[PDB]
Design a protein around this ligand. Structure first.
Ligand SMILES: *[C@@H]1O[C@H](CO)[C@@H](O[C@@H]2O[C@H](CO)[C@@H](O)[C@H](O)[C@H]2NC(C)=O)[C@H](O)[C@H]1NC(C)=O
Ligand code: NAG
Lengths: 50, 100
């Protein structure tokens, strides 16, 4: 996604509390982008006796 | 007994002491009405809850909400105000308050 975070001229990466990459900068366009995961949690089954 | 009985005028079935209690404790964030994509927009300043969520640690809602708990309480108190202590064993039996 696209974010509006300010960056320094010599900064490269942004790191979250979990110490994992979240925000990057495009090496050839010089614009800032943000990374988020895509999946989610699990399911459950309701059933009477077999 | 106007300070303990539930107040009809309130939009929710609660009583003034309970109402004063609820605002004196800072409950953690919850509600779960909608969660996906929340921290993508205006919450781009990430909150701790979705940061926890993204790593697979979750919480679950309780079986009984607050409303039915208030209902049980407004049941027990109404039972003990107008029937002495007999309704704990058998059928309810009414007694005037001063004799009790
Ligand atoms: C029962 O007691 C409550 C509180 O002591 C009374 O309610 C208050 O009444 C005064 C009037 O003297 C008001 O100024 C307060 O705003 C009331 N407070 C609340 C929380 O209601 C109530 O009037 C009493 N009931 C009777 C029948 O006298
Ligand atoms: C090569 O990199 C320069 C430096 O950003 C850029 O201006 C140019 O458009 C790039 N050209 C190609 C063909 O990738």
């Amino acid at each position: 996604t696209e974010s509006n975070k300010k960056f320094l001229p010599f900064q490269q990466f942004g790191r979250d509390i979990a110490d994992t990459t979240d925000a990057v900068r495009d090496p050839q366009t010089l614009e800032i982008l943000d990374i988020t995961p895509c999946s989610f949690g699990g399911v459950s089954v309701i059933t009477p006796g077999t | 007994f106007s300070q303990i009985l539930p107040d009809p005028s309130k939009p929710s079935k609660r009583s003034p002491i309970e109402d004063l209690l609820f605002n004196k404790v800072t409950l953690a964030d919850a509600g779960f009405i909608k969660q996906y994509g929340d921290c993508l927009g205006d919450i781009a300043a990430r909150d701790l809850i979705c940061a926890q969520k993204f790593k697979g640690l979750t919480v679950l809602p309780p079986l009984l909400t607050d409303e039915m708990i208030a209902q049980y309480t407004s049941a027990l108190l109404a039972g003990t105000i107008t029937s002495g202590w007999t309704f704990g064993a058998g059928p309810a039996l009414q007694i005037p308050f001063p004799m009790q």
